[PDB]
Amino acid sequence: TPALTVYLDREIALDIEKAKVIQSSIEYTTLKNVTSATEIYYDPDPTSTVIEEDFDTVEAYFSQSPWLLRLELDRARMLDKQLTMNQVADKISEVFSDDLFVMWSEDNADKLIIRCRVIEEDQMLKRIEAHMLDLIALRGIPGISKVYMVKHKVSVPDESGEYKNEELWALETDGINLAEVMAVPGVDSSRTYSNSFVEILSVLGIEATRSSLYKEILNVIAFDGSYVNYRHMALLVDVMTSRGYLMAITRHGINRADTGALMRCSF
Amino acid sequence: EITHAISSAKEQVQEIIYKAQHNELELKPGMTLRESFEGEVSRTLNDAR
Amino acid sequence: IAFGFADRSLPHFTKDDFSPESKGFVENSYLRGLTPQEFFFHAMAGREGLIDTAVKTAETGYIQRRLVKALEDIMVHYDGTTRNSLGDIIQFLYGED
Amino acid sequence: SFRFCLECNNMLYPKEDKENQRLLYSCRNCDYTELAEDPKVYRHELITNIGETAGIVDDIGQDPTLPRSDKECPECHSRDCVFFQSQQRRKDTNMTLFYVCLNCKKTFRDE
Amino acid sequence: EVEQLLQFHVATYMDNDIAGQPQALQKSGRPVKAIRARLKGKEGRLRG
Amino acid sequence: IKQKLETQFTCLFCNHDNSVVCTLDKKNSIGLLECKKCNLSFQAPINSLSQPIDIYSDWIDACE
Amino acid sequence: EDNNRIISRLWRSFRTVKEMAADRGYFISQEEMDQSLEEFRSKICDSMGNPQRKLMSFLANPTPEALEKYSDLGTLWVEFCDEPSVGIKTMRNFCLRIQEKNFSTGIFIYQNNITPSANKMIPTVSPAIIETFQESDLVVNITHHELVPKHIRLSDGEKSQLLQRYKLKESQLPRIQREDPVARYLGLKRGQVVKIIRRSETSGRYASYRICL
Amino acid sequence: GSPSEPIINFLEEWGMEPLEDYDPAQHTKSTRIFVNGVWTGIHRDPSMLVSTMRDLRRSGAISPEVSIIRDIREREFKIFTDVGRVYRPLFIVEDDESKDNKGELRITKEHIRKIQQGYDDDVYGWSSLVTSGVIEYVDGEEEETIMIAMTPEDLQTRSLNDTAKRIKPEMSTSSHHT
Amino acid sequence: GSEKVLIAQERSAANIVQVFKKAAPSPISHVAEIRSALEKGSRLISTMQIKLYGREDKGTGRTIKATLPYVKQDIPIVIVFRALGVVPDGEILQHICYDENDWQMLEMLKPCIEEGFVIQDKEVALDFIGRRGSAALGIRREKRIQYAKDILQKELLPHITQEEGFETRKTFFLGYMVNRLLLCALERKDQDDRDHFGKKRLDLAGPLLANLFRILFRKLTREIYRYMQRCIETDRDFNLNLAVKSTTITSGLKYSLATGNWGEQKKAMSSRAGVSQVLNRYTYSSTLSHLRRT
């Protein structure tokens, strides 16, 4: 269960609108997540079409290969994620150049339809569709599937000197991507914590990896109400973080030491 | 009183079932309809017990 | 209680039954009297718990053995440091105090 | 619905005749070519709903393990019908029940 | 052939758990207890 | 890309085992069996699911 | 639009590079460290908004305090690369420019990635030290994190005193890889000892020592 | 253990169509018949065939160990006559709506009297009750398409408030149970 | 003098198709397995598997391949279907699927038909099948086809039939298997529960002793064959009793009932141990519980 606990700034943690905006900008969204249906049509006339549903649309918009890729999107998915047709068209164009036409329909229509034309090609269109439904990314950080808005109660000293509980808004993002999340504007790039120490060792360092490991061990110990002294966990996290890298508690990290052979062969 | 509390818990579970089967149940963040329904039923039963 | 049968947990109930009495809710207590369905559910729960305990005890023993084999040559010397058998300093002071 | 050939009994493939500029269905083992009636060739449904109310049987009323309800039928108006949850085995399947009467065999929900 | 047989015997005398070939069996059915199996295992030398 | 493999088959002329090279080309669907001893060459038409055993059986059938 | 966020990321990377140069002991003017974003956009961006990486290269000299502490600190020439794909054509010109102006340490910053071929053209510039850093890895200063403490590069005399007090060799201290971000932030070399002052819930302040490989 | 040849003979005598006369374009609603795993044929009206097979199994012409399963949702008819199937005996409740014995048990006090006496009124043991038609054997697969009752008192609706005894389940999810 | 009791063994039922799903690090998504057994004797014969290749948006062609008994590589369903008897794709799709309105099944079967198109008849299909069925070098086409026919007849689904001229039942069974696999892969039906008691069998003393006696009788037959191979060249009439050794079967039965090792004496490894156990005679309840133990 990889998860990142992102903390927001002070001017943002007390606002739900800015927090929701940051969550929407951080959440990963691709074309496959918003695509509802895809179809392949044979349109020999580039200026007209055979389908009577998109007749008045193309006849008002207009005023190569005959194959046409017609993709119908979901209105609820495009409305909840706050995504428009212009942004999707621009994101498709920025990666397709002039090798694929893009014709989008208005939002006031009954169905969100997008037509594409290519300026033996039977399986080529299927391959192009499979490549589009696996690489076209709209917005967001890659690796962030779901985002949850959590309320954190922090004991802050008041202006008079007394500690009081303050409720702030933080984010919990599924997946691991600290290097790309820390660089997001409006995100506190000094308090973001990650549950995976492997990525911490590569992003921050070994000193932060030791603290993350100690925090994880303390949480695992105290989840069931048990309590263990700090010296034991400190020695445990210092032994694993002695050679500079993460040393496992298996035959790969223990037997790879400069100790005696009689001691290493006893495990 | 224990029997009345058990009957009230059963009535609440039946109401939750009726709300979930009529698209009138609130969706939990990060959970589907069945998962949220099962969690709510388990929480209600634990509170009643 | 998962639906072990066809959309049900026991043949004494109807299909698509999400009632508490058909999903493992023992209404009666030990003094009153457990129904055969509630008795079977309690037996299943006890068997699952016993199997989980008998499976996790060996895993915990293996984890403890690995931790002991990893931490066995650590000894605090007279200079206050915490080093192993090779002499590498793990902590400059035991417990940082 | 993908048809086949009536001569060598084989599947057909879509082709574009450029001399006449039209879509045709032509075989690969012989020289049979017919006219196409639907410009649609391939269709992929991402948010599909097929498999929910598509499987309807006639002997569903002879199963004593299915519970009964007191819903009124919109056709014969009978007080004897069965009901069952959605047979779609998806993780995001709605828990909306579907009712089936023991006369006209009509499927309806409670929305 | 005799050289290969002698090499196989020498190899099985010290290690009977060689992969890619069947192990040396006794006249009863069970394989020969080599010197490698005497050290490893729960009932071995070091751990026993 | 042509696939050049070394098989453990036996030549049907010089009787030399482990000396049969199979060169398959799926772009033109052509298999070639060559011997590294008496130096011969057998051409055969292959497909997309062909294998050196298939062309070996074809050569055996053509030799008899 | 995208140009605004690109210029913002470039300014953040420049501020991180300035903070890294100031932490290593080099003299940085107070008017340059506290540079705002509007002045940065007015000085770097042209008429269309495209920045110029050649106009951001600067030179920093060590402070007198760092010169008294470390006697092996020279000039630091910071140069930003204009080409996204660093190849054999740019590395040769960079090495020639470094060897011509007798630069002591030159920090290289690329845009996209670096081919493995040019990676071999870095140790061949000795005794000059060339360190490569990614732009995306320089957007956020990792030293300002809560879990990342403060590292102080110890001198030769302090290292010798610590080794004589503890009576140990150089292979008995906690090691740290050279590819570590904290090690690369200070330009650590093989044989340097760093001191870490961290927080401990049992005694308050704790002082530890590490050695780079 | 029981052979499958009499089962196939009875199925062919009743009205089972062979596999050579099967076609999905014409038989888009028939029910397949599986005997010990292998597919034998299809039937157009399995409602009468299953009833006749159950009547023959309850009469005595077929061995009581033969398991008969009818999957309506999957449209399958399985006749298991293999060896090693764990089965258990259960009473037979009249479910046919054509007599006054519906809703009650098929076994009455006369069967108990004949069992206690050990003979009929012009040996009588457990096999006699099975061959009569009041107790039938069901395995794990046949238990999937049947409705069993815990106690006979639950077969009929009652008209309490006892703080010492247990509480019976309400069972208010279904309107009427069969 | 020791009281030994045979403990019942819980095994999986035969002549049934069980569909399961594979893990993520694997190019296979669904696997339908069936261990086929003969009706007479109740012994295991072989096990047939059908695997659907193709991960979620990974694997290009989502083709299905079957594993025949005594084979070295997987063979697609189209090849074995054309080698059985039905060569046109229309008849194959009619025997496999029974719903022309559903397009998902047709789209899933399209890669299989596209991959199995180079085979247009039955001769080349049988020739390609026999090459993978553990065939030697030098069988030639005149005998490779006959070997592939014998491989496809027996071994492959023997519970259906074994006589000649009865391939329609095998084709229908293969079509039903493919239809069930496609229905389970389309998320229209849950996977088969392995813990279902309806698909389990309890082999008691009957089938186990039958298999043991069959193995002992095969060993005695081999011994009698070897004895007659030597007591014939002398041109002397044997006394019959001297050719049958009554010690082999008795010794094997005694060993298997005393030590519990099910199998031959020289093959103690890879054998089920613990079939015969010492009868606990501590009390009546202990014996009653040991007599009914699986």
Ligand SMILES: [Zn+2]
């Ligand atoms: Zn044709």
Ligand SMILES: [Zn+2]
């Ligand atoms: Zn009706």
Ligand SMILES: [Zn+2]
């Ligand atoms: Zn040769």
